[PDB]
Curated annotation (Swiss-Prot), chain C:
Subcellular localization(s) per the UniProt record: Cytoplasm, Cytoskeleton, Microtubule organizing center, Centrosome
UniProt lineage: Eukaryota, Metazoa, Chordata, Craniata, Vertebrata
UniProt similarity note: Belongs to the TUBGCP family.
Role according to the record: Necessary for the recruitment of gamma-tubulin to the centrosome and for the formation of a functional centrosome.
Summary of subunit composition and partner proteins: Interacts with gamma-tubulin.
Coiled-coil zones: none
Native source organism of the sequence: Xenopus laevis
Protein name: Gamma-tubulin complex component 3 homolog
UniProtKB/Swiss-Prot annotation, chain I:
Keyword flag Cell cycle: no
GO biological process: one example: gamma-tubulin complex localization
Entry GO terms, CC: centrosome; cytoplasm; gamma-tubulin ring complex; interphase microtubule organizing center; spindle
Cytoplasm found in the keyword field: yes
Protein name: Mitotic-spindle organizing protein 1
Family the entry assigns: Belongs to the MOZART1 family.
Complex formation: Part of the gamma-tubulin complex.
Gene that encodes the chain: mzt1
Biological role: Required for gamma-tubulin complex recruitment to the centrosome.
Main location: cytoplasm
Source species of the chain: Xenopus laevis
Residues that span the membrane, as ranges: none
Amino acid sequence: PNVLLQNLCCRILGKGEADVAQQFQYAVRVIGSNFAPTVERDEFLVTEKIKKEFVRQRREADGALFSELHRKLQSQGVLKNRWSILYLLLSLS
Amino acid sequence: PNVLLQNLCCRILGKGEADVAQQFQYAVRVIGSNFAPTVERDEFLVTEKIKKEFVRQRREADGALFSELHRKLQSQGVLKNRWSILYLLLSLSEDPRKQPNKTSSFAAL
Amino acid sequence: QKSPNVLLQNLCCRILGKGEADVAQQFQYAVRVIGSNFAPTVERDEFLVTEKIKKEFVRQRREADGALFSELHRKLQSQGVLKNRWSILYLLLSLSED
Amino acid sequence: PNVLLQNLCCRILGKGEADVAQQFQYAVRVIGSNFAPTVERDEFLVTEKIKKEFVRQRREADGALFSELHRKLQSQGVLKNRWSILYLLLSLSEDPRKQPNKTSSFAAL
Amino acid sequence: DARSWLEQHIVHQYWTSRAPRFSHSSHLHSNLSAIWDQHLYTTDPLYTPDDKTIVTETQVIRETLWLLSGVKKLLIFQLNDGKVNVRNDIIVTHMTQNCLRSVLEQIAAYGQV
Amino acid sequence: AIQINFIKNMIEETLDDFREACHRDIVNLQVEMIKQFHIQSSEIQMLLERYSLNESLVSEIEKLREENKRLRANF
Amino acid sequence: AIQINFIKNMIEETLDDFREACHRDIVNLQVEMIKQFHIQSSEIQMLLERYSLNESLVSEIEKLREENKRLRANF
Amino acid sequence: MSAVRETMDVLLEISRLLNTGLDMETLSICVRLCEQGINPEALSSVIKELRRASDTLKA
Amino acid sequence: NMSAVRETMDVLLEISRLLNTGLDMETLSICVRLCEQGINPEALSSVIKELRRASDTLK
Amino acid sequence: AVRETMDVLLEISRLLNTGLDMETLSICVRLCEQGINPEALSSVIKELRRASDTLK
Amino acid sequence: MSAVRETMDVLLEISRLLNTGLDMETLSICVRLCEQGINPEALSSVIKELRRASDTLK
């Protein structure tokens, strides 16, 4: 986990796994606490949230595509817990 | 302000005239952080919060009385500092049901 | 014996799975938390809390559990050795899960 | 960014350049935090809030001046951050039927 | 100072906790409430240690003597005319809270009338 | 129109209680902020007095000064 | 009257879902706030002890001063 | 000074009905503080913190 | 007295299992005693919850 | 851009009975276009205003 | 190696839809972190703060 967090920092700021220490430490702290939730393990609820956002902004077409793509990922049967990664992309939306 | 805030620190504790130093310096720090309020002035709005609160605690009679007392209050002398006074009494308002747990057993923790 | 601190040390010790001094740091933390100023949310009605718990069971589809709890509330009151029932009911409320 | 905040700090507090230290340092701190503000890129809601404010304050006309002057701004093609200016203006409003707290001698605490 | 003179020459307060409170005596028979209360705090693992207004010997009795021929007192939680009942935290130094109540309720009824 | 104004006025009654519960929560929160900073400030003040210098050393500079001066006030 | 109590209650239920959500966020925040204080205070205290330098270190600086003096004229 | 005596008798009625729990001497300090200007939030916040503190110190 | 503590422990123990919890009775018995020693329901909840957060991370 | 925008802001502030000079508004436009958070910006003015009142 | 890349590729298209230009590399890392047990809510705060700092700094 430690090394994964190091790669994440390196990739966002400009590559380098050193002298990004201050920002790393800060991230660690941020990771080391808990941030309030709305939902907790309902991958289904998040899929609704995505749709809901696409209707509010007049980006309905984008919502129509998403649904298809979301079925393809479901079909591959990959495991990582869908809820966590999908909610994270929605959160930076 | 210093002689007044201090005298409050002595009276509240009911004892200590330099043994309340900790509490004074603390009061001074707190006052030294700048709060901003949700609504500043209007006599009617603060008076209303106190009326609704009255109804809510089941002290309906008293709520009826408070209105007489409010009008009376203006006639014994007009206040420019009322919103703040009426607020202070608001935040210290309590319900006639239940106790707040023990706070005389809480010291031992 | 049954002082607030002793009762808290017993909690930490057994839950973390280690000895008295190995849980010493989390014991320090714990005390800091309790000694934080918290203002009562319950200054009224044993009833209103009992109703929220009943709402939790219905919300998760655990209706049978609410049917039994209601009867069990009545018993809990009746033996009445607890004089701070309400607080306990709030604690249990926050620990509500599926 | 600092150069500019400093100038706001110094002119408004009045010349001391040592009494303006505190507000200057705060101003850097708030801007140095990083967050995506909320109620940004929504100039439409902000205009409707100001028009209502003129109504509450019993000056119907002041809303009508505001719509006209606002449109005048759109037409020139000035500003690339219309919302922001509007948001600042709204925050700082005072209604001349409530009175903000003054205190002086606050320092002796 | 007027306040320090008033604190010394008038009995420590029992409606307010601002002036603490006589709660000692030198025999081993007069500390009974503390031992009995202790015994319970060792014996029952569920005990609430009741919070109690300390007296200050023979001042609850002059205020029952007030009642008995005069006005109501607010160290007694009386309600209406037909219910004059006893405050739920008054103790005397050398008696059990249960024991003391039991008498305060006798003379409560003789001030009820 | 009638029902809309009934529902509206009740929702406002409830939202007032809720606003005030939140308002109070920020006041309590501000207390918690400052009280923790006050404890800490107190720990630091004490520790920096101890570790930043030897209390030991200063009290022996005064001692040698008191002894040396007194010897010389008999010459 | 009866339909009114139903709609009202339904609005109350949605206001409970949200209301309880709003409280929970504050509670999280609080517990975190306290946490950050105790962590930061324990790190500040250990750190201050490293760079301020204990009494033991102070004594060895004086010892070294005593070594240079001895070496240079008492040997 | 005549004025000062009348206001306090009506004021003491509200505070005791509403549950506040301030004696006469203290109720005078707050009125001074509010006249010299104070944020209302600070004043309530201290009073609540001093009270909580006092009860624990005693016990 | 021994029966009374036990009957009380039992009614609570039926209820706890129903709302689900990983907790044993012995820690639940402490909680009753902590409530009984006073203490605001929010402080009690936070510390319990926090212990549980700390346990789960640890194992 | 600056002068014209200042004239419009100044008139709004006068309607609000809000004590602001010519100098604030010009500096405000310049920050807003190079990027300043409107929450940050606002808070700076509210705070600066409160301090001149405490000092004065 | 194929399999992770196939998850990240779907994720990449979704990121374009939401109108966000996360990198293909940043995505691969995120899938791995959340799969080990990282609460998502903290993690979004991290990505945000570092993207912003880089922007200011230049």
